[PDB]
Every structure is written in C-alpha cells, then in structure tokens.
Design a protein around this ligand. Structure first.
Ligand code: STR
Lengths: 339, 34
C-alpha cells in the first residue's frame, strides 16, 4: 500500500533483473522481487552501521527520506495485507528463522522479528545438517504447497541461523484459455531456431494494450480474478536486449499509463513451466551489499555482539502458466554463520 | 484485426494492484529450457 515501499521495491526488482540477465544472458529468468526484498529487510533488522546502510540502500530505499523504523513498519503492513483472506486468489507470504539453540539472541530481535515480519524462531540443530536441511525445506514446501521442495541444497554444519521467506501464488485467469484451442506450435528461440510448445489461444478478446513503437515492443495486461494481473511485454524479434535495458520504474509507469482497451482477434500464449535456482551472492555484491558477507559484518542487532556473518543468499522460483490460470512460488534463504 | 503472438522471448511481470508489489518477474527465453 505504501507508495515509498512500492517505489523502492520496484527499483530493486528491475535492478535485480538486470544483474541476473548479465550473469546468465541465455537463460530463462524467474524470481520473486518481493520475496527477496522481504528476506533482506528481515536481515537488516539485525544489522548495524555500514552493514545496515548497505542493505537498505541496496534495496533502493532513500535513507534521506525514510528511516529503518519506517521501512520495517512498511514491510509489516505489506505482509499483513498480502496474507489477508481471499475467496478469489490464493496468496501467502511467510518468514521464519531457524537458529542453533545454543546461540544467544537479543530479546528485542526475536520480538521484533515476530512483530514486524511474522517470524517465529525455530530451534535447529545445524550440526545434524541433513535433518536441519530437511526441516527448512519442509517449511518451504509446506508454505509453497509443494511447489518448491529443494531450496536448501547444502548446509554448512557450522551454520548458526537461516532466515527464510516464501511466497505462494495461485490464480485463475479472468478470461481462461480453452484447452481445445491449445496446439503444438513454434516458439522461436532465434530467427533461425525454434522449439515446439503447446500454444494456448484466446479469441475475440478486449484487453489493455499498448504498442511501444520507440522500444519496439508490445505490452498487454491479462487479469486474474482478484486484485492481481500480469504485464506481458513482447519485444519484436531480436529486440529483447533493447527492452531489457529500458526496464525501470519509469518505463513500467509509462506502460501502465499508456494501455488502452483494444479488441484482439487472436492472442497466443505458450503453456509452460519454468524454474530457476539462484546463488545471489555476486548479485547482491553488485548492488552494493558487501560488508554483511565479510569479516567486518555487523549483525550485532541479532545477538548483541559482532559474532555473525552472512555466508550465502539463495533464491528459487517456479512459474507455471496454463489454460486455467497461473501458479507461481518462490523462496529466499539467508544463511548465517559465526564470525 | 490485431494478433498478439507470444512465439518468441517475452517478459512477464505479475503485479498486485493493491500494494503495487511485483510478485514475480520473468523472462521466457525458452519454455522448454534445461
Ligand atoms: C495501472 C496498473 O496496472 C498498476 C499495476 C502495477 C502498478 C505499478 C506498480 C509499480 C509501481 C511503483 C511505483 O512506485 C511507480 C508506479 C508503479 C510503476 C505502478 C504504476 C501503476 C501500475 C502499473
């Protein structure tokens, strides 16, 4: 609901996207910006000094116009809003902390974690890494209704804490595709190469539409039942990189404001499921989040001492698009060790 | 008549109209990619 939170989180989304594509320019991308934003906001709760400022600025907050306390309350309100009951769309977001029982935590930290981020503190025996890994993965599998089963691949036996966020999304199209109209068709990987995919179709449809001639792309909005929708951006053949370079809060605002209703004779959309697993360490470094990974890490808001450091931030996401609607889930984990 | 054919790489941005959150952002370069 927060205008300043929406602006920072969208700036972060597009800055993250651009780094992911730079890292792996030939790959599908799928990730949840709000899952990663919330996980790192959760982390910043325990951060102090340069570690803290780097995280908040990396999340694209203007600290000359907002404070850490405002940010945390904004995320609290976001989680409350996202997790409201709904009869139309399924959406849930949860946070948890898995902590070695022997690790002394500030009362202020665990209280704030629960109050602001809805997070319990789960005592976890990381020295039994296989069982600790199973527990965290089960938490994510439960939260994502089975969609994400292997967020944690490896877990150091000397892990002290893991912060986890998940998002679960299941929605029906306002205008669903008839499966009888789904046919094998070409999906062109390049001008010369294609793969055969099930191509769904809708006919005689009136939807928001914008041909962006300057950017050589077409934008359409398809609605879910509920307060969610999806912006599809279709660059002309071989213009994807030109469009990616223009991705920004300003461009998305422009697109949203330029859409007009148009009767579409035929719309063709593949039925597909894609997933990606990410090690976000180099990504977050590129966005300026550095000290939290170093021996100079200041996470003294968690314990009272500068005795913890991030080892790895991971993210996994899955997107399933089909005739009835969309299912998408993601989860983010912040692994923390002793320092 | 206008035809919109997602038969080449495209982007998806799943948005919440209530909070203006971007739930998911995607580039489909290959729906059958390994
Ligand atoms: C009108 C509409 O579809 C809404 C849905 C998502 C909304 C966008 C969500 C992200 C966003 C954050 C901002 O702070 C600038 C405005 C924008 C860019 C919003 C503009 C209006 C949008 C595009």
């Amino acid at each position: 609901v927060d205008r300043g939170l929406a602006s920072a989180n969208v700036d972060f989304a597009f800055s993250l996207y651009k780094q992911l594509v730079l890292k792996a320019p030939d790959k599908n991308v799928i990730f949840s910006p709000v899952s990663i934003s919330t996980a790192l906001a959760f982390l910043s709760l325990g951060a102090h000094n340069t570690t803290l400022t780097e995280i908040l600025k990396g999340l694209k907050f203007n600290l000359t116009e907002t404070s850490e306390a405002e940010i945390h309350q904004s995320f609290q309100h976001l989680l409350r809003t996202l997790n409201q009951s709904s009869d139309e769309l399924q959406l849930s977001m949860g946070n948890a902390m898995f902590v070695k029982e022997q690790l002394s935590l500030l009362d202020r930290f665990t209280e704030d974690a629960k109050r602001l981020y809805g997070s319990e503190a789960f005592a976890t025996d990381f020295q039994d890494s296989a069982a600790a890994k199973k527990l965290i993965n089960d938490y994510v599998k439960n939260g994502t209704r089975g969609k994400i089963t292997d967020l944690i691949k490896d877990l150091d036996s000397q892990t002290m804490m893991v912060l986890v966020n998940y998002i679960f999304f299941k929605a029906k199209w306002e205008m669903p595709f008839d499966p009888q109209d789904t046919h094998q068709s070409r999906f062109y990987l390049s001008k010369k190469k294609w793969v055969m995919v099930p191509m769904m179709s809708l006919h005689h449809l009136t939807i928001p539409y914008f041909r962006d001639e300057e950017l050589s792309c077409t934008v359409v909005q398809l609605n879910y039942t509920g307060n969610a929708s999806v912006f599809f951006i279709l660059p002309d053949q071989d213009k994807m990189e030109e469009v990616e370079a223009m991705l920004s809060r300003e461009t998305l605002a422009r697109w949203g404001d330029s859409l007009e209703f148009r009767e579409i004779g035929e719309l063709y959309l593949p039925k597909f499921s894609i997933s990606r697993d990410y090690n976000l360490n180099d990504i977050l470094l590129q966005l300026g989040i550095e000290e939290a990974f170093t021996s100079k890490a200041d996470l003294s808001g968690i314990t009272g001492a500068r005795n913890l450091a991030v080892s790895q931030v991971v993210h996994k996401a899955v997107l399933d698009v089909f005739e009835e609607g969309t299912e998408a889930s993601a989860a983010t984990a912040v692994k923390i060790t002793l320092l | 008549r206008t035809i919109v054919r997602f038969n080449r790489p495209f982007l998806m941005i799943i948005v919440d109209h209530f909070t203006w959150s971007i739930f998911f952002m995607s580039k489909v370069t290959n729906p059958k990619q390994a």
